[PDB]
């Protein structure tokens, strides 16, 4: 009988088109006592819009129970604390976990695009790189598009702590060497709390 609390996705807390949520995951609920009660608080005050999902029996016949609380973008961004209180027959006393956005002076990402190495141009596919550095906190989102159409064949490294106490990451979009060589325009867009409008986008093409 144990509890985990997860934060919203960074893109969700940043885009008004999205709905962010905090999630409370209880594992190893006994089959003998699958009843689980969730009480949620925001800065100490009780809210009631949480929703419990259909429980999931595990291979060993224990249950897994998830509670999901939609939150306000601005409450998460301004540092409110989200507390989940978990209740079950099997528990001596109820369990509490709390979560909140990472504190510290925010710092605006710098965003640079880098073209394929010349040695890479012998291959069928090439590598378009975006360097994102200097940002704080680590919560960030990254996508790629080409003339407004989404790309999918990209991989973005987890943020990594740099030598000045800010974070950095690289995102690599893989594309057919043909599309690169015939001058198609690629764009990486980055979403972060410290950018004007929570986003910027930087373009890359053959010159």
């Amino acid at each position: 009988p144990s509890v985990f609390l997860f934060p919203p996705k960074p893109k969700d807390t940043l885009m008004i088109s999205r709905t962010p949520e905090v999630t409370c995951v209880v594992v190893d609920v006994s089959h003998e006592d699958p009843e689980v009660q969730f009480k949620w608080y925001v800065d100490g005050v009780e809210v009631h819009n949480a929703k419990t999902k259909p429980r999931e029996e595990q291979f060993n016949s224990t249950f897994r129970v998830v509670s999901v609380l939609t939150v306000l973008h601005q409450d998460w961004l301004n540092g409110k604390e989200y507390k989940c209180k978990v209740s079950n027959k099997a528990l001596p006393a109820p369990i509490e976990k709390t979560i909140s956005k990472t504190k510290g002076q925010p710092r605006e990402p710098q965003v640079y695009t880098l073209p394929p190495s010349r040695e890479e141009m012998t291959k069928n596919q090439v590598s378009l790189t975006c360097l994102v550095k200097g940002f704080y906190p680590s919560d960030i989102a990254v996508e790629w598009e080409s003339s407004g159409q989404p790309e999918n064949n990209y991989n973005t490294t987890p943020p990594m702590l740099d030598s000045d106490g800010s974070f950095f990451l690289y995102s690599k979009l893989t594309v057919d060497k043909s599309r690169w060589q015939q001058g198609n325009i690629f764009s990486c867009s980055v979403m972060h709390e410290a950018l004007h409008n929570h986003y910027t986008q930087k373009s890359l093409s053959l010159s």
Partner: protein, 53 residues
């Protein structure tokens, strides 16, 4: 009681090739986010070395 946190602070306090400005930045980092003390100390040790006389 967080040993790693207290330890990162101590070792950073005594690193001889950091500026006061850098020393201060790393100690503020440790306060902002204790859960990454290991990585803050590694970054500090790595900067202290690159700044050997």
């Amino acid at each position: 009681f967080n040993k790693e946190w207290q330890n990162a602070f101590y070792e950073i306090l005594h690193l001889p090739n950091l500026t006061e400005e850098q020393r201060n930045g790393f100690i503020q980092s440790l306060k902002d986010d204790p859960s990454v003390s290991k990585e803050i100390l590694a970054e500090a040790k790595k900067l202290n070395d690159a700044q050997a006389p």
